[PDB]
Every structure is written in structure tokens, then in C-alpha cells.
Ligand binder design. Structure first.
Ligand SMILES: CCCCCCCCCCCC(=O)OC[C@H](COP(=O)(O)OCC[N+](C)(C)C)OC(=O)CCCCCCCCCCC
Ligand SMILES: CCCCCCCCCCCC(=O)OC[C@H](COP(=O)(O)OCC[N+](C)(C)C)OC(=O)CCCCCCCCCCC
Ligand SMILES: CCCCCCCCCCCC(=O)OC[C@H](COP(=O)(O)OCC[N+](C)(C)C)OC(=O)CCCCCCCCCCC
Ligand SMILES: CCCCCCCCCCCC(=O)OC[C@H](COP(=O)(O)OCC[N+](C)(C)C)OC(=O)CCCCCCCCCCC
Ligand SMILES: CCCCCCCCCCCC(=O)OC[C@H](COP(=O)(O)OCC[N+](C)(C)C)OC(=O)CCCCCCCCCCC
Ligand SMILES: CCCCCCCCCCCC(=O)OC[C@H](COP(=O)(O)OCC[N+](C)(C)C)OC(=O)CCCCCCCCCCC
Ligand SMILES: CCCCCCCCCCCC(=O)OC[C@H](COP(=O)(O)OCC[N+](C)(C)C)OC(=O)CCCCCCCCCCC
Ligand SMILES: CCCCCCCCCCCC(=O)OC[C@H](COP(=O)(O)OCC[N+](C)(C)C)OC(=O)CCCCCCCCCCC
Ligand SMILES: CCCCCCCCCCCC(=O)OC[C@H](COP(=O)(O)OCC[N+](C)(C)C)OC(=O)CCCCCCCCCCC
Ligand SMILES: CCCCCCCCCCCC(=O)OC[C@H](COP(=O)(O)OCC[N+](C)(C)C)OC(=O)CCCCCCCCCCC
Ligand SMILES: [Cl-]
Ligand SMILES: [Cl-]
Ligand SMILES: [Cl-]
Ligand SMILES: [Cl-]
Ligand SMILES: [Cl-]
Ligand SMILES: [Cl-]
Ligand SMILES: [Cl-]
Ligand code: NA
Ligand code: NA
Ligand code: NA
Ligand code: NA
Ligand code: NA
Ligand code: NA
Lengths: 311, 311, 311, 311, 311
């Protein structure tokens, strides 16, 4: 088999469409997601023209091996897609209607800067390489682009699934390549992070601040050190759900900042004890009373600054 | 091969059945379950009809490649099913009896609102796409729907395996699609959650309340802070067995509420110490004595409210 | 190809045998084990009979596709077995000797009631479905049932590998099915549980009982609470190696009971301190002295009761 | 195709060789290792003999399907090897030279008695089953046994890769079987265990012994209990890297013994406090001073005894 | 098919090129990385030469089976590459242009000495084995070596992708082997290690040094022991992201050194308490005041020494 011949000198247009059936396993650490979808392809092959009068049938059904099929691949996939041909329908003029159902693990970079209040644009890049006899170009059939109503991505809200209609045509290894960008817009369901991570982290921090209403050094050391250890546990828990980033994430910034609050609280607790042993409790009382206001105030202002810089 | 031709204009009815052999790996985080079952298919192909008295044979056995077989797929599967054809039998009138044994990983959303006292309806969606020559519709042969007595799903009780007899017929990408809903009703075996999570979580909370019978601030801080850390460990353990939900689960609600009880207990312990240092122990005694009743009473009432809102 | 015709009306007997080469990956949580074995099949096919004199051969070798072979399947497997045909030999009377080497992941329920001092009976269910032409029945060739001397299952002792000679013949989807039960009896190597879990768990519990020889409330709170946290860690460790069961396991029962001992120890420590503060130490001394005997005695008797109920 | 006929009655000798290209993933828990190697096979087939003078060709190249090839398998593999034929060459006398590149996951038991200062002998068992026409025997071509210079097994030192030249010939299921033992000798790189596990474990134990220079019961309880919890963490960490063994490992023996030292240290701390409360500090001082010498001395002697019993 | 015959006695030159499409999953523990790339091959086959005038074409497109193709393999891969042929083109003089898209898991040793401020040279080794008929040698077509601009390796910066132009020609089992070294230079994005591991580890260590401004032994024991436990948690966390090395890593050296600082801090805290109990506090004050300077000074100098030895 060889590609369809050009009537003039034009490239062969392969109309494409992706219909999402299932979306699952969005792995934040791996920056991957699994997809199960329909891939529709359409091109004119005049060598397959037929008379419905002679053949009896109005539409011809072919096996993939019997006819020429464009070598369509995905750019951003771990391994080649697991594909099963559903139908190959050829109409009298030679217009081929190809339909396959596929499953693939897609590589798509994620921006964690606003985590867990982040939104992402997942990409599925469709590609075709031009052959010697003729250049192959990709197009989007908007009528064949969509998603099933039941498509759910655990821990995410699906906003839209659209395609950039204009392909990216470029030279690669002395041949033309036609690339299409299918975009799946999603927003993270931040809900569960509030009762599971955010609020427990705030509770332990506020518990450490009870040391500002205590003169007992040994109880203060227990309050600040124990809650710090619990904060380390939450820091470790958060970083297990995330990849290592060359930038600070919103959660990472708050988590890091809270360490400074624990560190200054230890200094205050140390300074307070030192002065009381030195028979200067009036002075220790001034520092402790100021800390009761300073710690929640500086914490509120620093969080307003952080929220502003990130959102 | 081509589909059987219609006698009038009727769609081709493909009778279906699923017989469960094995049910395993219900993954709560992934919202998947693995299945090993028999898939039975039945349709009329008049081009295959034969005389019973002339032929001598009452049934004719065909290889899948020798005859036309409807392209039956599962909607909610990770990858295409691993299938092996068991038998193909044709009766004199041309009624085809198809049987295959398959294995598949099924995507089925789970409602965790009542966890670990939750019940689920797992779905297996059967689908057929119509051809240009004729429309293909699915039907349920109730005699061929069932499950093996030995079918066990670890940590779950299997209630029923039924099929919604009426298919969901709809247009998808300019062709008819016939969808059947096979439902596997299950209820969670909550047993183990009681001695492993619920009771140990209650024991540590009740241990924190012993601080209401102690005047020792240093020991009280140790009691409330250490038990809170153990509660954080149980919160982390519970969330590792569950996916992130855009709603509160029953267990999640209790776990979150218990943090408030630890927080108020720290306030009480702080207030008690502060008053004793201020030479007001008669007062600290009134707050401590009230706390001995208030804490278990508010805990009981809040749990009755939560159980009512969730069940 | 079609099944061998009956001389009278008798069912076709397929003699079976399983020879274990490798046993590995017994997953307690998944209730699975992997197997690598020889599967031997034997049946009479008169159509393949030959005379040794005119043929010059005492035996005839065939390719699987050249002759009829019974569709033998495993009931309790995750996916269909990975099989490679080793040999197909035909004797003059048409007696076929089939041999394949296979690998499979087997689903077999485990009884954890006596864990880690439990014994299991793993099952490998062989099955054949009858055809319209004739009924196919399975039999056991005891001479072809066995295991390699080097067969080792990590963390387990292999007792026996036998087959229930009488098949379970029953109707499934209007066709008769012949099922054989191959049983692999194993006993858990409990050894490592003693120095790694049992003894460390007993040491921390006995350490909490040193509080009965101390009047220091602050030190007592530290002793009981810290060891309880270590007991929670062991409870979590044990439950990670086990699936969730709708019954109590022997280890689970001891682990749960130990929480009650920690809870009563906290009450004793609280009662002791309360009385001392109330200027009643003579009385606290009576409760503490009684606890020194009561705690180890009640622990010994409760363990005798538990061991009796479980073994 | 059929096997080469014997000139007299001799068995067919299949000369073998394994050349290791890659060694990776030595899984201690699973007792497996992955291998990527060349498998070389050589045997005489007189039916393939040719004249080198008239043919003008010294060697003939065949495709696997064109000639008879012995069914060579591995005994100790999870699944059948993933093999690709590299070359088949036939000399004028009919000597066939077969070469394939394969990858396999090998099951090989490990002796953990001396862990992490252990050495292992990994096995790769080559096997051939005799055919009815003739007996097949295996041999080692030492000229075709070896390993690539770059072969590295992470966390291990590769000593040698040799083959036991004499095959193990035995009857299995009424046929002869010829088995070869390829041995890969390795020694564990214990280096990292010293700064990561051994020394931190010794530091915390020596920190618990500072309680022998303290009269403060509350601080002593904190010293011994906190370090014991850290020892439990190291015990858990060590057991996660190891399978469960029906014997004591060297590390396991030390870890278990250290618990006894923590237990006796708690007794000493309890006895010391009890005597001081009883107004007997002169006596408590004698026990504490003796403990300062006894604890490190008994620890040193017990470790010498353990090292002697294990090495 | 047979290899192209030599015009004189020259070896067959196979020009190669690798164009990286995707780089993902750099596993530090496994010392592997996954790659998705184009593999280009070019060689002269005179038997395929044609006249452009006579044929009416300037290029000839073949199927892989129709012509001779060199058996090109990767040395350092887990399993054989997953490859799909994209195009095969023949010029009039018999110059073959082969293009395939492949995916492979590559084994490449990593030097962790400078972790997490390390740089690596990942290798992809291309190999060809000579045939009895002729010697095959590999070459690099620099015009066909490169990478896509979007190629990202999570947690790493990609510096360059170059090839060592001269192959490593050597004998392996009496046949010439031609090996090419494709090098992917990467540098670790150390950023996240600073707020997640380095700084929290420094904060807890500096918190342990507050004990040098405290005379309270019980609070000092709590300060040093609790922070040491948190340091053990960070040591465990770091070692889970790394394989076991027969050398010290930069992070491993700092982590190990910090244990010595905790150990000496416990000695100081013990010595201080012992002297105060012995009625020698003036002396304890001299040791404590010296420790306030000695600990941060020795820590700074030891870190300068370590940074110098490692970088
Ligand atoms: C009687 C005073 C009641 C104080 C209630 C505390 C309000 C906490 C609000 C939390 C918001 C979520 C912020 C945490 C610090 C709490 C201060 C501890 C109480 C001080 C006791 C003084 C004794 C007179
Ligand atoms: C009033 C003294 C303020 C001390 C501020 C501490 C500086 C910490 C620098 C951190 C660098 C990152 C290095 C940690 C030691 C901190 C010493 C604790 C304070 C001593 C109390 C003395 C009471 C007069
Ligand atoms: C510790 C600090 C507590 C965290 C503070 C909340 C973070 C935040 O401010 O979150 C804000 C995001 C809103 O995001 P948005 O509109 O999608 O972003 C795009 C916005 N632009 C385009 C205008 C830049 O989510 C929320 O509605 C937060 C609701 C949860 C409150 C958590 C309370 C605890
Ligand atoms: C901390 C709070 C302790 C937890 C309280 C039990 C939760 C509950 O109330 O559980 C209730 C569920 C019953 O569920 P149901 O009838 O299937 O629900 C559907 C009901 N509708 C249709 C009427 C809405 O389970 C049980 O029988 C609980 C038995 C275990 C007792 C645990 C003691 C600890
Ligand atoms: C002598 C009084 C015995 C108290 C027994 C405690 C009952 C606990 C019931 C648990 C139910 C499961 C609820 C936990 C609080 C326990 C209070 C501790 C005792 C108070 C000491 C006062 C000394 C006179
Ligand atoms: C905390 C309490 C400590 C645990 C007590 C041992 C459990 C037990 O009693 O174990 C009993 C099992 C024996 O089982 P069996 O004969 O196979 O069972 C079938 C018996 N029938 C058929 C008669 C019912 O193992 C042992 O030999 C235990 C030896 C290890 C001692 C552990 C010391 C710590
Ligand atoms: C001088 C008394 C020595 C006591 C030795 C302890 C025996 C422990 C046996 C463990 C069995 C395994 C059972 C744990 C409680 C230990 C009691 C603590 C000592 C009491 C101090 C009294 C000071 C006179
Ligand atoms: C806590 C106790 C600390 C552990 C003591 C070291 C273990 C040991 O004694 O290790 C010994 C092994 C040597 O092994 P070998 O010669 O291969 O054995 C085969 C010997 N036969 C054939 C003679 C029986 O390693 C070493 O060289 C130890 C060097 C590391 C020192 C660790 C310091 C901490
Ligand atoms: C002035 C005494 C300095 C003591 C130095 C401690 C040596 C530690 C050797 C570690 C080997 C690795 C062995 C751990 C016990 C430590 C003893 C604590 C010091 C006792 C204080 C006495 C006050 C005069
Ligand atoms: C505890 C000790 C704190 C860690 C000290 C930093 C490590 C270091 O010194 O890191 C040095 C590397 C630079 O590496 P380079 O130039 O690529 O190496 C090759 C250099 N040759 C060729 C000259 C040998 O990173 C940095 O730029 C450090 C920035 C991070 C600061 C961390 C603050 C905490
Ligand atoms: Cl693809
Ligand atoms: Cl399917
Ligand atoms: Cl099977
Ligand atoms: Cl094999
Ligand atoms: Cl390869
Ligand atoms: Cl050489
Ligand atoms: Cl050569
Ligand atoms: Na084609
Ligand atoms: Na068909
Ligand atoms: Na304390
Ligand atoms: Na057959
Ligand atoms: Na062959
Ligand atoms: Na070829």
C-alpha cells in the first residue's frame, strides 16, 4: 500500500477527532494521566472509489491491512497507544471514515505554584509525519471532538475538552510533521485539603502559642517541640503527594514559613526562662505579653502577603 | 464478513448475559475493581440457517473468524478486556449462541459519604455501535445473568448482580449506540474498623480527658499533646485508604471534630494553669469540674447529630 | 477440528495432572499466590489411531493446531494462564499425551483467624465445558500430580500437593461443566513474628507496668502514654500485612486487649495522683500494690482464655 | 521439523553458554533478580551438512522456523524469558550455532543469616526435556560463558559467573530431563548500613545509658523510653527491607538483644527511684555505679558472642 | 535476505541517529530512566540500486520484511525496546534510510557523591553484532542526533544530548561488535531540598542548642532527645529516595555528622546536671558558656571541610 495521489500538488488532509470515554489516574508526582477515548480519522482515497450499483452496497467496510491508513501517533505518551479498530467505512467518492478506541498514559507537565488551589491544561498531542510521495497535514473535525457526560477525574473538576484547530507544521529530520493540540482543562478539588491538612496544621500551631500564657519552661518546651514534630509529619505527608519543583508551591511556602514561627517561639520560650532564672520576670512578662499579640498578627499579615504573591 | 440483513427494517437484537466467576481487588483510592466473567451473546443470522432433518446435526460449531460477530465493548474499563472465545453454536433457524470468558479492570465511582458503613452499586456498562447497513440494539437474557456461589470480594458483602433490562439507546458521533447497565450491589464489612481504628481513637481521646482530674500542668500538657499526635497518626492512616473527596465522609467528620475536642482541652488545661499561678484555684476547680461533664456530654450529642446527618 | 466421537454414548474423559515447578508471591492482603507448573492432559482420539508396522513409528508428534485439544481453563485465576506447549505425543490406539508449562496468579481465600500461627489450603480449580456433540469429564492421573523438591514458598512450609480425584460435575449456562480441585496445603512460618512483633509488644507493655512502683505522676503519664503510642505503631504495622477481615484474628484480639490494659493503667495512674493530692496516699498505696499483682495476673488469664478460644 | 537422528544410539548434546549483559533489581523481599543476557546453543544436525568446496560458502544462515531447534527453558523464572534470536549459523559438517538475547526475572533463594555482611550464590537453571525419538543432554561451552565488564548490581559486588559443567540428568513425568546450574556469586556492599542504621542505633542506645549519671527519675524515664521508641523505628525500618525468615539474621539478633538492654535499663531506673523514695540513696548509688560498668561490658561481651556464632 | 556484499573487503557502515521526543521517570533507587525517541538508520545496499529515468521515481518505499535491515540493539535496556517502523526509503544508488519510533527503560549508573547538588551523564549504548558473511560498524550522523525543545525530565535540567562519534569496536564470542555511546547530560534541581529537608534539619539542630541557655535538665533532655528523633525521621526520609551506596554522599555525610553533634550535646547536658547535683555549678556554667560558642563554630568549620572535600 502507498498514500493517495494528489489531484494537483496539495497536501493530504487527515481530519481528526478525540471523544473521551474515560479519564483516570492523574498522577501528580509522575505528571501523567490515563485516557480511554475514540480516535476518529477521515481522508479521501480516490483509489477506493466504487459504484453502489455494481458493488450493491452504498458504503464499503475494510480491514486496516487491506487499505492505506495514515500513521497517526501521539507525541506525549509513555508507550504507543493500545488501539482497537471499531470501523473503517469507505464511501463512493473514496472518503474513508476510520474509528478506533484507544487507551494511553499521557505525559503532561503540571504547574504546582498554586497547589492545592491549582488549575491545569492537560495536552494530548496528535502527530503525522509526511512521506516522500506527499505531505500529510492534520485538521480538526469539531463535530467529532468531545467527552462522555459521565467522564470523572477523581479529585478534579473537568472544565472543557477543546482542540487548537490550527496544526503546528514543522520540519523534523528532513521531513514535514503536522501536530495538533487537544486540551483538557481541569481544576483541583481543594475541599479535602482543608479538614485533612490545612486546619490540623493550624490547630497544632495555635496549640504551640498557648506557651505564651505559661511560665512553666518544661511544659513550654513540650508544647513547642511536640507540635513542631507534628508539623514535620504534615510537611513529609504533603511532599509525598508532590514531585520536587524548582519553585515554591503555595502550600510549600506556608509550611516553610510555619517553621520560622516554631523557631521564634522556641527563642521566646528560652528568653523567658533565662530572664526568670536571672531574677528578671517583669521583663520576661513584657516579652511574653507582646508575643501573645505579635505571633497571631505577624502570622495573619504574612499569610495575606503570601496569598497576594500567589493569587 | 458483513452483518445479517434485516427481514423488514428492524434493528439487530443482540441478547447479552454476564456470569461472574471472580470479583477481586476493589481499590477504594483508584475507584476500580477487577472482574473475571463469562460474556454470552445471542443473535439471529439467517445466512447461517440449515435444515435439521436433512443435515442430521442439530447444532453447528463455528470459529470466530468464519462468521460475523457483533463488536461488543465495555464503556467503563481501563483497557480493552482480555477475552478468550469458549464456544459458538448455531441452531437450525440461524440463532447464534456466543460465549467468551473475559477479565477486565472496571472504573466505577464510589460514594464514601457513609464510610466505613457504606454500600455501593458497581457498574459494568455493555455497549454496541451500529453499522451503516443496520442498527444494533442490546437486550438482557436474564437466564444468562448471574454469579458463582464462591464469588467473594475481600472486605465486602455481595448483595446482588442484576441488569437494567432496558438499554440506553443514544446517538454518538452520527451513529446509534446501545448501552446496558449491569449492577453489582455490595456493602462494606465495617467490622475490622471498630477494633483497629474507631476504638483506639476513642481510647486516646478518653485518656486526654484524665487531665480534668489533674492539677499538674506539665502532666496535662503531656496527656493532651501526646494523644493529639496519636490522633494525627490515625487521621493520616485513614486518609491513605481513601481518595480525596469534594465532600465530608462520616469517619472524616468524626476525625475532624475530635481535633476541636483536643483544641478546647488544651485551652482548658492552659486556663486551669493560668488561674492557679494567679492564685485563683477555686475558680480553676469550677471550670475543671464542669469540663468533666461538658466534654463527654458535648461529644455524645455531637456524635448523635453527626450520625443523624449521615444516616 | 471437532471433538472425538463416542463409541457408544460415554463422556470424553480428559485425564489431568499438575506438577509444581515454582511457588512464589503469596500475597496475604490480595489473597493470591503465583504458580509455575506443568499441566498434563490425556484423552483418546480414535481418528488419530495408526498401525505401528506400516507407519514405522511407535509414536506420532503433532502441532496443537493440527489436532483437537480440550479447552481446559482455571476457575480461580486473575487472568488466563501464560502457557507454552512442551509436547503432544500420540500412541497407536490414538491415546493423546499433552504437556504444557504454564504460569498463573491464583485467587485463593485465606483464613486469618489463627494468624500468624495459621495453616491454609490453597486451591487450583481445573475446568472443562461440555460441547453439543458430547460431554467432557475430567479425571486425575495421580502418577502426574506432584511438585519439585526445591519448591519453596517464602515465609511458608509446604505440607502436601494432592488432588480431589472425583470432579464436581454441574450445569453452567445450559452446558455441563467438569471441575477438579487441586489442593496445596501450607503452614505459616511464625518464627520471625516472635522477635519482631510479639516480644517487643510485650516489652513495652511490661515497661508501662513499672508505673506501679512509682509515685511520680509526671513520669507515670510519660511511661503509659509513650508505650501506648509504640503499641499503636505495632497495631498499624500488623494491619498493613493483613487484609480487613469480618472476624477477629488471634493477633488482632491480643492487640485490641492490650489497649484495655493501657486504658486501665491510665485510670490507676490518675486515681493514684488524685488521692495523693487529696492527702489519701495510704489508700493510693493499696490500689497501686494490688495493681502490681492484678495487671500481670489478669493479662496471663485473659491470654489463656484467648489461646483456648482460638486454638 | 523433527530432531536430528542418532548415528548409533547416543543422546543429542546441546552445548550451552550464558553471557551476562545486565544484572539489575535484586529484590531481597521477593528473592528475585532481573537478568539480560546472551544464550548460546550448539548441536550437530547432519541433515544440514554441506560441501564447502562446491558451495563456495563456509557458513549458511537459517531462520528459526526453517530448522529444528531444541526447546531450552529456565527452571527458576517467574514467566518464560522474553527472547529475540540474534543469529543461526550452520558449518559444513552440520554443526548449528544458535544465539539469542533474552531478559528474565529469576527466582533464587537468599541466605540472610549474616545480613548485611552476607554473600549469595544466585542460580540460573537451564533445562531440556527429552523427546520420544531421542534423549537430549546439556553441556557447557566455557568459551561462551561470561559477563560484560560494565555489569553492576546496585548494592552488591559481583565476584564470579561460572557454570557447573556436569548436568543433573533425571526422570520427570516419564521422560529424561537435563539440567545445568549457572552460578552468579555476589557479596553485599554493607558500607551504607554503618552510617544509616548501625551507628545511629548505637548512638541512641549510648544516650539511654546517660541515665546512669542522673538521679532525676522523670528525665531518666524520658531518656530510656524516647530512645526505645527510636529503636522500634529502626527495627521496623530494617524489617521492611527484609523478608520474614524461619531463622535469626545477624542484624535481627543485635536488634532483639538491644530491647533486653532497654528493658533492664528501665528496671534499673525504677529500682533507683524506688530506693531514693524509700530513703535508701546510698544503695541506689551502688546499683547505678555498677550499671555504668555492667551495661557497656555486657553489651561488648554479648556482641563478641553473637559475632562469633554468626561469623 | 542476506547482508549487502562488500565491493572490496570493507565493513558495512550503518549511520545512526537518536532524536529524543520524551524523557521521563528518572528513578534514583533503580538507576533507570524512560525514553521515547526516534532511531534513524542508514546504510548502502547496492542490490537495491535503481535508475530514476527507467523506474519513474526518485525514491523507493519498502516494508521491513521486503529488505535486509541491520539487527541494531541497545546494550543498557531492561527489556528489548518497544519499536514501530515509521519509514524505509531507498535512493537511486541504494542508500537506505530507516526510521523507527521507540520507547525503552534504560539502565544507567548514577554518581550520588554530590547529592542533591549532583550532575549525571546518562548513557544510551547502541550496538550491532557482525555476521559470518561481513563485519558491521556503527557511525553517527550528527544531523540526525537531537531532542525536542519540550523534552523535560521532572526534577532535572537537561544540558546536552551528544554522541561519541567513534564507536567501541570489540570481539564478543568470536564476532565483531560495534558500540556507540549516546550521552544525555543532566543536572539535579536541588531547589526543593532546601525548604523541605536542609533548612528543617538545621532548625531542629539549632533548637537542640537552646539547651546551652538552660539549667533545667528535664527540659534539656526533652530538647535534645526530641530533636534527635526528628533528625532520625529526616535521615530515614532521605535514605528512602536513595539507593544504598558503597561511598558517602554529601547529604549522608552532613546527616551522619549531625548525630555526633546530638551525642556531644547529650554529654554536655549530662555533665552540666551531674556537676550541679555535686554542688559545682560555677564549673558547669563554664562548660555551658563554652558550648554556646564551640557547637556553632565546630559545626560551621566541619561543614566548610565537608563542602571542600565534596566540591
Ligand atoms: C477565658 C479565656 C478564653 C480563651 C479562649 C481562647 C480563644 C482561642 C480562639 C481560637 C480560634 C480558632 C490562638 C491560640 C492561643 C489560645 C490562648 C489560650 C487561652 C489563654 C488563657 C488565659 C486565661 C485567662
Ligand atoms: C535577646 C536575645 C535574642 C536572641 C535571638 C537568637 C538568635 C538566633 C539566630 C538564628 C540564626 C538562624 C543558634 C540557636 C541558638 C539560639 C540561642 C537562644 C537565645 C538565648 C537566650 C538568651 C536570653 C538573653
Ligand atoms: C494557612 C492559610 C490558609 C489558606 C488560605 C486559603 C487559600 C486561598 O486564598 O485560596 C483562594 C482560592 C481561590 O482560587 P481561584 O479564584 O481559583 O484562583 C484564581 C484567582 N485569580 C485569577 C484572581 C488570581 O480558593 C478558595 O476559594 C479558598 C477557600 C478555602 C479557605 C481555606 C480556609 C482554611
Ligand atoms: C465515634 C462514633 C462511634 C461510631 C458510631 C457507629 C456508626 C453508626 O451509627 O453506624 C450505623 C451502621 C448501620 O448502617 P445501615 O443500617 O446500613 O445504614 C443505612 C440506614 N438508613 C437507610 C436508615 C439511612 O452500622 C452499625 O450497625 C454500627 C455497629 C458498630 C458500632 C460501633 C461502635 C463503636
Ligand atoms: C474510683 C473511680 C473509678 C473511675 C473509673 C473510670 C471510668 C472510665 C469509664 C470508661 C468507659 C469506656 C472517660 C475517661 C475519663 C476517666 C476518668 C478517670 C478517673 C477519675 C479519677 C478520680 C479518682 C477518684
Ligand atoms: C501475647 C501472647 C503470646 C503468644 C502465645 C503463643 C501463641 C500460641 O498459643 O501458639 C500456638 C501455636 C501452635 O499451633 P498448632 O498446634 O499449629 O495449632 C493447631 C492446634 N489444634 C489442632 C490442637 C487446635 O504455635 C506455637 O507453637 C507457639 C510457640 C511460640 C511461643 C510464643 C512466645 C511469645
Ligand atoms: C530488686 C528487684 C528486681 C526486680 C527485677 C524485675 C523482674 C522483671 C521480670 C520480667 C519478666 C520478663 C513485669 C514488669 C514490672 C517490673 C517491675 C519493676 C521493678 C520493681 C522495682 C522495685 C524496687 C525494689
Ligand atoms: C552493633 C555491633 C556492630 C557490628 C559489628 C560488625 C559486624 C562484623 O563483625 O562484620 C564482619 C564482616 C566480615 O565478613 P567476612 O570476612 O565477609 O565473613 C566471612 C568470614 N568467615 C568465613 C571467616 C566466617 O564485615 C566487616 O568487615 C565489618 C566492618 C564494619 C565495622 C562496623 C562498625 C560499626
Ligand atoms: C568529663 C567527662 C566526659 C565524659 C565523656 C563521655 C565519653 C563518651 C564516649 C562515647 C564513645 C562513642 C557510653 C555512653 C555513656 C556516656 C556517659 C556520660 C558522661 C558522664 C558524665 C560525668 C560527669 C563528670
Ligand atoms: C548543612 C550545610 C548546608 C548546605 C550547603 C550548600 C551546599 C553547597 O555547597 O552546594 C554547592 C552547589 C554548587 O555546585 P556546583 O558549582 O554545580 O558544583 C561543581 C563545582 N566544582 C566543579 C567547582 C567542584 O550548590 C549551590 O549553589 C548552593 C546553593 C544552596 C544553598 C543552601 C543553603 C542551605
Ligand atoms: Cl501513539
Ligand atoms: Cl472491552
Ligand atoms: Cl486458565
Ligand atoms: Cl524460559
Ligand atoms: Cl533493544
Ligand atoms: Cl577485542
Ligand atoms: Cl568478526
Ligand atoms: Na494500511
Ligand atoms: Na467476525
Ligand atoms: Na515530659
Ligand atoms: Na484444537
Ligand atoms: Na524450529
Ligand atoms: Na529484514
Amino acid at each position: 500500500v502507498s498514500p493517495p495521489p494528489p489531484i494537483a500538488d496539495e497536501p493530504l488532509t487527515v481530519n481528526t477527532g478525540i471523544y473521551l470515554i474515560e479519564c483516570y489516574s492523574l498522577d501528580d508526582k509522575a505528571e501523567t494521566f490515563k485516557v480511554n477515548a475514540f480516535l476518529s480519522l477521515s481522508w479521501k482515497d480516490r483509489r477506493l472509489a466504487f459504484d453502489p450499483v455494481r458493488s450493491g452496497v452504498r458504503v464499503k467496510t475494510y480491514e486496516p491491512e487491506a487499505i492505506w491508513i495514515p500513521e497517526i501517533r501521539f507525541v506525549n505518551v509513555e508507550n504507543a497507544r493500545d488501539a482497537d479498530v471499531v470501523d473503517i467505512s469507505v464511501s463512493p467518492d473514496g472518503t474513508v471514515q476510520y474509528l478506533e478506541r484507544f487507551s494511553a498514559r499521557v505525559l503532561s507537565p503540571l504547574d504546582f505554584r498554586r497547589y492545592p488551589f491549582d488549575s491545569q491544561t492537560l495536552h494530548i498531542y496528535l502527530i503525522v509525519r509526511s512521506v516522500d510521495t506527499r505531505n500529510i497535514v492534520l485538521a480538526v473535525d469539531l463535530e467529532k471532538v468531545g467527552k462522555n457526560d459521565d467522564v470523572f477525574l477523581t479529585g478534579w473538576d473537568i472544565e472543557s475538552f477543546t482542540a487548537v484547530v490550527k496544526p503546528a507544521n514543522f520540519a523534523l529530520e528532513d521531513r514535514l510533521e503536522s501536530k495538533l493540540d487537544y486540551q483538557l482543562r481541569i481544576s483541583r478539588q481543594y475541599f479535602s485539603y482543608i479538614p485533612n491538612i490545612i486546619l490540623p496544621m493550624l490547630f497544632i500551631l495555635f496549640i504551640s502559642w498557648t506557651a505564651f500564657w505559661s511560665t512553666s519552661y518544661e511544659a513550654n518546651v513540650t508544647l513547642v517541640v511536640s507540635t513542631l514534630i507534628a508539623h514535620i509529619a504534615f510537611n513529609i505527608l504533603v511532599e509525598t503527594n508532590l514531585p520536587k519543583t524548582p519553585y515554591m508551591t503555595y502550600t510549600g511556602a506556608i509550611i516553610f514559613m510555619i517553621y520560622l514561627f516554631y523557631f521564634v517561639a522556641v527563642i521566646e520560650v528560652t528568653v523567658q526562662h533565662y530572664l526568670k532564672v536571672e531574677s528578671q520576670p517583669a521583663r520576661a512578662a513584657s516579652i511574653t505579653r507582646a508575643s501573645r499579640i505579635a505571633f497571631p498578627v505577624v502570622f495573619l499579615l504574612a499569610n495575606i502577603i503570601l496569598a497576594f504573591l500567589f493569587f
